[model samples]
Target: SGPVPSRARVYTDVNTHRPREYWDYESHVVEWGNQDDYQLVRKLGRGKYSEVFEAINITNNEKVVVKILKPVKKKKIKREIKILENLRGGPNIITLADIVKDPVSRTPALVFEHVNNTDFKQLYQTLTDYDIRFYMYEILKALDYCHSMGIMHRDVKPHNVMIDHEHRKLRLIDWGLAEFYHPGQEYNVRVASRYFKGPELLVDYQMYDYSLDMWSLGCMLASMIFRKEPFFHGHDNYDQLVRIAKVLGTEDLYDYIDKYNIELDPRFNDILGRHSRKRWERFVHSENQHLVSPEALDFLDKLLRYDHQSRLTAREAMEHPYFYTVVKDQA
Candidate 1:
């Protein structure tokens, strides 16, 4: 070799070398259940893909979440069911108890183990610095577990992270956008919520891998530390990238897209321009300074880099010095 390569592969097996069937959802067989077994209690929320309801499992007398999927492709539904089934016992992964179809309307529904989650908006504000660190570490466990199993949670945000603060419980929910990793496979850049979308998605790098989730986790952590509801509030997908660029710096973004040989979408011709990276200290203030530390900023720098591969892996992040004190405090 002329010279040893400088960088190491962050995702060791970017293309998870498993049987094709592991990532194939079309071949998955749906085990349908009777919708009559669960009675709706109240509406929990609605997403672009489904209507959510709190329900009682009449058969077992247990509370559960009923997710009635919106009319979508049969294949998409199958993917969610199969991924949930495969990750059933993974740490902090939401439990999918049953899959049912309405007898009359033929609409499909998923019943999940119920979580007593406090609304994130109200809950996050009340968290102490230690509370934030503790929960962030817990989320890392979930991310690491899923990545270890060859899945990438394309969607990761505070709303999707369920926290039962009283019970010290955390769970990663919403498998609708989750997908199994197949190295070099192109994926839809439109999967994650706008604010949480990684640079790879914004630049239309379809072959991005698990590092996308790490970026989203970084965004969530940024908001928590800075006390901004959305650390980067983009008006739309285009604006979302612009917001990120404003903070991350456009020069680095250009460098990232250039290295990957990604073409800038025509729409970005005018919107995309040079921006110098803003200092992280610019976000700290007297009110939030207690939560701000050198290690915290350094950890964020590693996760929020313009290059997805440059971001720390979930497992590596958990071992960062930022968590050293948090781990000691736990004991």
Candidate 2:
């Protein structure tokens, strides 16, 4: 690959300064736990990468989430384990309780701390203004903690955020797509889910860093506050960019690409069109107006910028006034 433009954001090389061993997935050895120790209770869900189950740890009689890996590269599995181990004790991170494999098939599985999570779609519908702020702040804590440890959670979306609403608890889950941030490394743009994909990923900006997660966080927040299942609903990757340009303005996108000397994907020639920036207030409605406020708008504005670097860091976002009341109340 030719020289790709680096992100204009902060914390670009936080991982590079960390010990190489911390991120060297290949160097790590998988110490398999006893598969017989955990018994599957029921299937919870499935994803592109794994089949999830509510399992019982027979040794301790404790409930846990058992994520059985689908057929994938060993290195990919190793990387996920290494990253989880590295960030094990960090704030609000989904805890990896054990790693096990099926004795007969040798299928690998990850046992994690059980989270009493409600589906975000159903949970978000019942949220008060304070609930939204409180949960979002909880996610930010996870983000900030991970970023401080020199890692970037490549995929951040509602599905990956687990909220035990009744208990006011949150945990950032799924490290399968998370990676250690090394400055100047080109990452696959096809990381996050479509609706939550950052502008950098859509534009094929390979050198993006931690700020990409912040962009996804913004999308999640927007969906909650505006009552849109997906705030930026894109039919495809090409359509994804168009969806964002319509709200953030196509002109700013052009400027962002020009600043980085990025070549437009030939597909954009037909679909890319001029769109004036949309006003956030246009999305406000009776249903979601309760969550709308000056601070909410300001926080969203800082996050959903066309330029990745322009988005708030997780720590910075946690300090925004939008969350002040709830955060203070929690304290």
Which candidate leads the pack in TM-score? 2
lDDT of 1 by residue, 115-145 (tens): 9999888998888888888999989999998
| Over 4 Å off, model 2 | 1-4, 46-50
Q: Write the per-residue lDDT of candidate 2 for residues 1-331, one digit (tens) a residue.
A: 3434675366666766777788889889999987899889988884554599999988789999999887778899999999999999888999999999899998999999999999987888999888888889989999999988888998999889888877877899999999888777889998989999988888788988899999999999999999998988999999998989889998899999888878789999789889999899999988889989989999999999988877899988988999878777877
* RMSD of every prediction: 3.4, 1.7
Q: Give the clash total for candidate 1.
A: 1
Please give the TM-score that candidate 1 achieves against the real structure.
0.93
For model 2, the local distance difference test gives 0.88
**Candidate 1: misplaced stretches above 4 Å?**
1-20, 46-50, 329-331
Clashes of each: 1, 0
State candidate 2's TM-score: 0.96
TM-score to native of every candidate shown = 0.93, 0.96
